[PDB]
Amino acid sequence: VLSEGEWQLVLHVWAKVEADVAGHGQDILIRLFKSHPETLEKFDRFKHLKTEAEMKASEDLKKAGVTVLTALGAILKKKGHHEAELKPLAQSHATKHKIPIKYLEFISEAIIHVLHSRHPGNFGADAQGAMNKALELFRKDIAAKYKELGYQG
Numbered sequence: 409v410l411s412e413g414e415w416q417l418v419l420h421v422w423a424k425v426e427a428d429v430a431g432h433g434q435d436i437l438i439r440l441f442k443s444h445p446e447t448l449e450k451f452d453r454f455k456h457l458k459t460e461a462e463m464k465a466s467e468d469l470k471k472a473g474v475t476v477l478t479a480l481g482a483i484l485k486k487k488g489h490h491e492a493e494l495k496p497l498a499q500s501h502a503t504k505h506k507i508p509i510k511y512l513e514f515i516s517e518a519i520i521h522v523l524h525s526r527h528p529g530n531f532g533a534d535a536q537g538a539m540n541k542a543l544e545l546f547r548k549d550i551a552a553k554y555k556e557l558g559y560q561g
């Protein structure tokens with residue numbers, strides 16, 4: 409369970425993300441696809457992209473970046489009260505997309521890396537710890553849902 413102070417460190421960096429969610433989402437998905445290229449194979453729309461330049465030019469990847477971060481943002485804003493948001497996400501990621509928990513760890517790492525690079529003003533050690541704790545909570549709850557849904561993750 410996060411404290412309110414922890415949640416406020418999360419939401420104060422999120423506020424900066426939201427100056428330009430598309431740009432943040434592009435950087436985060438590119439980081440994921442560069443650090444763990446195997447993750448690209450989950451995407452019919454993107455498994456063909458060969459280079460960071462191709463990724464940066466992809467309007468579909470930019471839209472995806474907006475989607476992921478907006479959905480995550482809505483979860484974070486619930487401050488742990490996110491059962492309703494996690495239901496459809498778990499179901500789609502478990503059953504249709506087949507996203508293992510390891511890959512949710514990889515995108516969490518990508519988010520942290522990008523925020524640390526972009527936002528040293530709002531992503532010092534305390535703030536990074538709070539974001540890691542929010543992301544770990546998210547992954548714990550999603551994994552519990554995966555199990556309920558019949559997917560080992």
Ligand code: HEM
Nearest residue numbers: 447450451453475476479480496497500505507511512515
């Ligand atoms: C913070 C974690 C994540 C959030 C909040 C998130 C959110 C979403 C949302 C809102 C959609 C669209 C609706 C849906 O299909 O449920 C979606 C689609 C998808 N997500 Fe995620 N996602 C997350 C992580 C991941 C990861 C790590 C992967 C793969 C490595 C992944 C793969 C996909 C795929 C394959 C689709 C469908 C793509 C398509 O229609 O072209 N997601 N995600």
Ligand SMILES: C[C@H](Cc1ccccc1)N=O
Nearest residue numbers: 453471472473475476477
């Ligand atoms: C990471 C993945 C990105 C995505 C979301 C929506 C459409 C395509 C790709 N999940 O949000």
